[PDB]
Amino acid sequence: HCHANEYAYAKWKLCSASAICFIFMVVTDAAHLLIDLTSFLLSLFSLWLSSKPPSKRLTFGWHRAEILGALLSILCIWVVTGVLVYLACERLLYPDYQIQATVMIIVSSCAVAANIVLTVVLHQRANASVRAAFVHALGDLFQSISVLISALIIYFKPEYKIADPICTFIFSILVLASTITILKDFSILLMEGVPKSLNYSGVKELILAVDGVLSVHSLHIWSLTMNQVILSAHVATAASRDSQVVRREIAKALSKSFTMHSLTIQMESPVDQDPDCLFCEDPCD
């Protein structure tokens, strides 16, 4: 008949961390004291949207909205990065600037400790929702050390005085290198692309492992947000065989292969027309 364990593990992840970065929240230096707080509050928002039920307009529910908000946060990250870059290139163009070289250090003192508390505690031992907040936390950890160490030279030998530019540069660059991966991941998720953890051809062999299947076309198997996969394909079997028990055994095999979320099978007839099935011939791969 084809028919709150791990998501609930996330309630104790940010609801506290939100208040923590809130307490965390020089006047211009306190600017990024909220870029993390807002992001993680929106992450919790995404969690509550994952809690939502299905509907008619949204038959599957309100799930991918989580990735939507995630990528929105990532775009705001893209934003704040370029902001810092503008500051750095301008202050390169304006190499003159005066401020005590430790007043920012002494407040980055708690910051490096502030960030690392929430960052690596949020480290894994696998919803990307958590990971998106983590790489942000891991991201602003760079902001914690972008000026802390890079200003000590000014405090010690200001004959260079511009180590903050290069350190900000490299840290923002590494944040972006962190982004690119999950960026392309989220893309192919929303791009209706099959999940990374799966091998289309592998699933094909899983199918063909049954005596019943003689051919399969119009196969489509993509996933929801994280581990919720949807399956569709056509199949022709021996006309002598009972599709019902056949398809039941098929679904049995697909389940015993690995997890599923939703499966549809056309169960076509052997009849069928290969020479012009080219419309769904095969994925070019």
Write out the binding residues for its own copies, residues 174-203 only, by CB under 8 A: 187-188, 190-194, 200-201
Question: Any contact of residue 213 with its own copies (CB under 8 A)?
Answer: no
Which residues on neighbouring strands pair with residue 242, listed in sequence order? none
What span, in angstroms and rounded, lies between the C-alpha atoms of 248 and 244? 6
Tokens of 159: 């004959």
Of residues 183-242, those binding Zn ion (CB under 5 A): 217-218, 234
Strand order in the sheet with 262-265: 215-223, 229-236, 262-265
Interatomic CA distance for residues 167 and 149, integer angstroms:
9
Q: Contact with its own copies (CB under 8 A): which of 1, 5, 90, 98? A: 1
Phi-psi region of 262 (alpha: psi -120 to 50; beta: other; left: phi over 0): beta
Which residues have CB under 8 Å from 273's CB, separation 6+? none
The helix (H) or strand (E) run that includes residue 217 is: strand 215-223
In the list its own copies, Zn ion, none, the entry touching 28 (Cβ below 5 to 8 angstroms by class) is none
Decide: is 247 part of the binding site for Zn ion (CB under 5 A). no
Q: Which of residues 72-101 bind its own copies (CB under 8 A)?
A: 75, 79
Number of chain positions touching its own copies (CB under 8 A)? 59
Question: Where is the binding site for Zn(2+), in residues?
Answer: 1-3, 32, 36, 63, 136, 140, 217, 234, 261, 268, 277, 280
Residues that bind its own copies (CB under 8 A): 1-3, 53-65, 68, 75, 79, 187-188, 190-194, 200-201, 217-222, 224, 230, 232-234, 243-244, 247, 262, 264-269, 271-273, 276-277, 279-280, 283-285
